[PDB]
Ligand binder design. Sequence first.
Ligand SMILES: C#CCO[C@@H]1[C@@H](C)[C@H](OC(=O)NCCCCNC(=N)NC(=O)NC)[C@@H](C)C(=O)O[C@H](CC)[C@@](C)(O)[C@@H]2OC(C)(C)O[C@H]([C@@H]2C)[C@H](C)C[C@@]1(C)O
Ligand SMILES: C#CCO[C@@H]1[C@@H](C)[C@H](OC(=O)NCCCCNC(=N)NC(=O)NC)[C@@H](C)C(=O)O[C@H](CC)[C@@](C)(O)[C@@H]2OC(C)(C)O[C@H]([C@@H]2C)[C@H](C)C[C@@]1(C)O
Length: 498
Amino acid sequence: STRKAVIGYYFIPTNQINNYTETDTSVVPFPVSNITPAKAKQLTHINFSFLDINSNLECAWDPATNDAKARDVVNRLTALKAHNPSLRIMFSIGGWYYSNDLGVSHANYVNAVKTPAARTKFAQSCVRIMKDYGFDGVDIDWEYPQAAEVDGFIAALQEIRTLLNQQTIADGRQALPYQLTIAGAGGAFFLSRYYSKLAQIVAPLDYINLMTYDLAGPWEKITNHQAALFGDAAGPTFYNALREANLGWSWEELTRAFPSPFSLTVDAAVQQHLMMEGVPSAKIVMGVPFYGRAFKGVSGGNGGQYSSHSTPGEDPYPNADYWLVGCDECVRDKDPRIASYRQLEQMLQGNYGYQRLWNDKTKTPYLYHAQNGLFVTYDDAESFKYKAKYIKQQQLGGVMFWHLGQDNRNGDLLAALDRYFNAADYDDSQLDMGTGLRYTGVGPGNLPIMTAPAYVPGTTYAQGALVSYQGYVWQTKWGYITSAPGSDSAWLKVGRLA
Ligand SMILES: C#CCO[C@@H]1[C@@H](C)[C@H](OC(=O)NCCCCNC(=N)NC(=O)NC)[C@@H](C)C(=O)O[C@H](CC)[C@@](C)(O)[C@@H]2OC(C)(C)O[C@H]([C@@H]2C)[C@H](C)C[C@@]1(C)O
Ligand SMILES: C#CCO[C@@H]1[C@@H](C)[C@H](OC(=O)NCCCCNC(=N)NC(=O)NC)[C@@H](C)C(=O)O[C@H](CC)[C@@](C)(O)[C@@H]2OC(C)(C)O[C@H]([C@@H]2C)[C@H](C)C[C@@]1(C)O
């Protein structure tokens, strides 16, 4: 009955704000008017990226942003609401540049959540900003708080929530309540910084936006798909860092939740969230990329997949060699490692040597240039079907993507998602998800339905025996056990009843 969310990030730089225009694709490639009325129906939210946090621990614009020009750009967005019953113009604070451990503004994020006084100051400053420009909510895309600074981050979220609720009340917005989201890590290494406190992080949120992409890059030893749905046994595996999180669980409970090594996939990140108690599927949103990640130096043999590579990982890109054959955006934006789906469809469609291939295990596409040893991992309307099925099957809240300004001018990626959830003509029940590797981890938040003979006191239970008791199914870790299930360390809760 309820609609899957469709959360589209929207980026525009400070300099394109201050020289903003609707008619010069040289000064502004993707201006607001680019977003049709029919497109504005297709999105539930639009995250206007990015604001930041200045030395005073307040939410702010880039010091050299011009207010009037900044203001005009937002009303144009908020205007879109006329076309859509449900649209929210969120604003997003953070991004990688501002908030990474060695980003420009990093310390501000640390100090803004460090104390009650600061959290008060900062949270007020978020809402103050939200109303003062017409925004329908707040997104916090801090990549990422670390253990000591997670508690404060939590508190910050709680504070903002309360202030959003006060404002929802004040403006009589029960029809469309001011919302709070974050962009969350989509991979175990980064997710392990706050994993143990995930239920508290999610509680004050309408959604957690899983950045289930950028899971491969130049930093890796080996080329890999950046947003594989399921795992390919030919591909690389990784250490499950979540088995070392401060959870206080037993060896069995850890082993059962965190297989290691494992495949770094979308399914993996989602199940990892589901495994925690108090994290409802409905709040979990699957990110997907509207860009492609490009590698060079790939030895052939297997489509450029899982190969050693010569892609620099420095920031910024350290030279003037734009090797990504026939990507103008890469020249103008000065980085060949990232390309929009717009620019990718060109590259392929053109006369270029690129070969679009398909991995039937990961259900993702990838471009292979055999002449120049190039490999590109990305998503398209074809992979989006399998990701759309998963969202349904697993009963997630919907989809997020980065970003809208990297879809084409028609907007067929956006339209393809909207189709897979909504459009009544569309169907995907026969769609084969394949024999890709699933994350099989089980935790206390995603216990499978099971049955077993009822436990009987006085009975001696061997290693492995299963019984039913007080609503749950239990399993003996060793034998022979006579204690009541749950009363000592010999029992493992493996499933639930009825
Ligand atoms: C998203 C992102 C990463 O940040 C970019 C910037 C870092 C770009 O990175 C990029 O697009 N990488 C894609 C992978 C995504 C992994 N994180 C992620 N998906 N997060 C997420 O979904 N959050 C919701 C790069 C191409 C770039 O343009 O960087 C130039 C230098 C080449 C900057 C550093 O000068 C850059 O210039 C512009 C283009 C004007 O953008 C600003 C920034 C100052 C901006 C502050 C950062 C910015 C949005 O582009
Ligand atoms: C390569 C390399 C060495 O560089 C490292 C840094 C580059 C790490 O090095 C590395 O590749 N290690 C072997 C990888 C196997 C596991 N696989 C894996 N972790 N995959 C994964 O997380 N997918 C999303 C990389 C995994 C990393 O975490 O890079 C992130 C972006 C994904 C950075 C670029 O944001 C990174 O973030 C932190 C962790 C804060 O550190 C800095 C840097 C800003 C730092 C400059 C980079 C630095 C030292 O960790």
